[PDB]
């Protein structure tokens, strides 16, 4: 069965800014099939009031979502995105780096 | 606007 | 100037926890604007864009309608490709359509698409002829046969050059403060230091619409297509989208580098460089 790992993106809406609120993002692109477990964390806690959008392909047929929430950057608090699928052989976390 | 036509694989 | 009206719609079977699960959405260029899912509480197709919630009670209640008809065919399909590929129940599997069409500039019929897919590959597509199909392996000639013998392509064809053409117009009016701006991408390059010797040069489009767009860097005008970091393009969350590509290089070296930037709202493409 065909198998194709989820690219994620962890990334603010709008240049993050300490005391500003912003929106956290996580897009998750090019899987397949289409069952994944998507969470924002926020340092190490999973953040409740995430939503996501509704699931959509490309011409290729693998599948793309994205994850958000509102926050307020602050320089100590450390965000990321945990992903699971698969072909993920355990969760993968990618950090939100703000100085890409 | 949707299709209204019924197609089977 | 061009435009595209495109319905996706996902079936996914979970075996003994219920009836495969519907997930449908539309889309006018690069902005959604209904959806319908099986597991939610209001089983009805769903306004996801504003300009879409002024139309009537009829139609709402009609896309609702031919949505679960959408979510009938599908059901019966993952049964139909279950017994053309001698698969069990253990399983989940996957299948995905795609149609809709595209116009100009002048808003007159370009071409129609209508696709399937089965757990991830191609099964059966509509050519661009609008007359004819292609059939990925041996099932998916079997239900060529059968769509050959059902005239399907002709009705589809009165579908895509008719029906999905004007309300792909209707929506572009309604709608042409959001769908027929383009925004053109606010571009920047980013330089941090990897090591005392090597650099990651980093190129932005941000606040960018419709989403097509190119980025390429070129060192002393060759392109390093092979030599780049190319993220897929992503939503910023409001109706724009965001992309980077990114380079490694050795530290001295920046002035050889240039990013270049095709997107339609550029008057020209643009040249980025560092100096």
């Not at chain 1, 450390?78 to 699971?84: I, M, P």
């Not at chain 3, 060529?144 to 050059?161: F, I, S, T």
């Amino acid at each position: 069965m065909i198998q194709r790992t989820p690219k994620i993106q962890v990334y603010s809406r709008h240049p993050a800014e300490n005391g500003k609120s912003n929106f956290l993002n996580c897009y998750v692109s090019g899987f397949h099939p289409s069952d994944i477990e998507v969470d924002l964390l926020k340092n190490g806690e999973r953040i409740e009031k995430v939503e996501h959008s509704d699931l959509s392909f490309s011409k290729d047929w693998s599948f793309y979502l994205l994850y958000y929430t509102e926050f307020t950057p602050t320089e100590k608090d450390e965000y990321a995105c945990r992903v699971n699928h698969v072909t993920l052989s355990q969760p993968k976390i990618v950090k939100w780096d703000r100085d890409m | 606007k949707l299709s209204h036509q019924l197609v089977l694989l | 100037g061009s435009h595209s009206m495109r319905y996706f719609f996902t079936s996914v079977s979970r075996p003994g926890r219920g009836e495969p699960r519907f997930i449908a959405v539309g889309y006018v260029d690069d902005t959604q604007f209904v959806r319908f899912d099986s597991d939610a509480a209001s089983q009805r197709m769903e306004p996801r864009a504003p300009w879409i919630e002024q139309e009537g009670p009829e139609y709402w209640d009609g896309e609702t309608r031919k949505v679960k008809a959408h979510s009938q065919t599908h059901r019966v399909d993952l049964g139909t490709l279950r017994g053309y590929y001698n698969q069990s129940e253990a399983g989940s599997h996957t299948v995905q359509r795609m149609y809709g069409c595209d116009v100009g500039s002048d808003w007159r019929f370009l071409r129609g698409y209508h696709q399937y897919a089965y757990d991830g590959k191609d099964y059966i597509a509509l050519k661009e002829d609008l007359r004819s199909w292609t059939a990925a392996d041996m099932a998916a000639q079997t239900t060529k046969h059968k769509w050959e013998a059902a005239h399907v392509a002709e009705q589809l064809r009165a579908y895509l050059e008719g029906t999905c053409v004007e309300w792909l117009r209707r929506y572009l009016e309604n709608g042409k403060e959001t769908l027929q701006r383009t925004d053109a991408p606010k571009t920047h390059m980013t330089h941090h230091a990897v090591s005392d010797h090597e650099a990651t040069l980093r190129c932005w489009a941000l606040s960018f619409y419709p989403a097509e767009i190119t980025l390429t860097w070129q060192r002393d005008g060759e392109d390093q297509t092979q030599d780049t970091e190319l993220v897929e393009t992503r939503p910023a969350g409001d109706g724009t989208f965001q992309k980077w590509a990114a380079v490694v290089v050795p530290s001295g070296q920046e002035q050889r580098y240039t990013c270049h930037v095709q997107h339609e709202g550029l008057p020209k493409p643009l040249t980025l460089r560092w100096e």
